[PDB]
Fold Multidrug efflux pump subunit AcrB.
Amino acid sequence: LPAGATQERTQKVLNEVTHYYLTKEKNNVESVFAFNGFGFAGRGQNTG
Amino acid sequence: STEEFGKILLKVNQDGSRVLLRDVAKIELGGENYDIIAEFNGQPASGL
Amino acid sequence: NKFQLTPVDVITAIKAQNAQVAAGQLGGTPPVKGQQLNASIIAQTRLT
């Protein structure tokens, strides 16, 4: 997400990423471990 | 215990009534910090 | 002496007015639901 984006927003997008992986790819996907808090650019409420 | 903590005396009023910690705050077990929400298939999780 | 001050007053002033204060964030974890703003709170910065 971009600069300022609250955790709650970043969760929506994260719940979407998990949803897509749990439907459109149900056959390949085993599990999604979603981490709303830190990426690799940094830590922060706008990363995941 | 949260109960012990809430029973912390902060102030005695002029008339003799007590001002307890639970009178100014919400005691509850919780986390060291709330920066990372980690869901597993959209469920709350921990792990190593 | 003119102004009734010792080097203790000086040292106290310097530690009070030359300080780096941690002041938290607006909209920080743990968050209320429906928050759009997450910004750092900035207070005293060391003199330069």
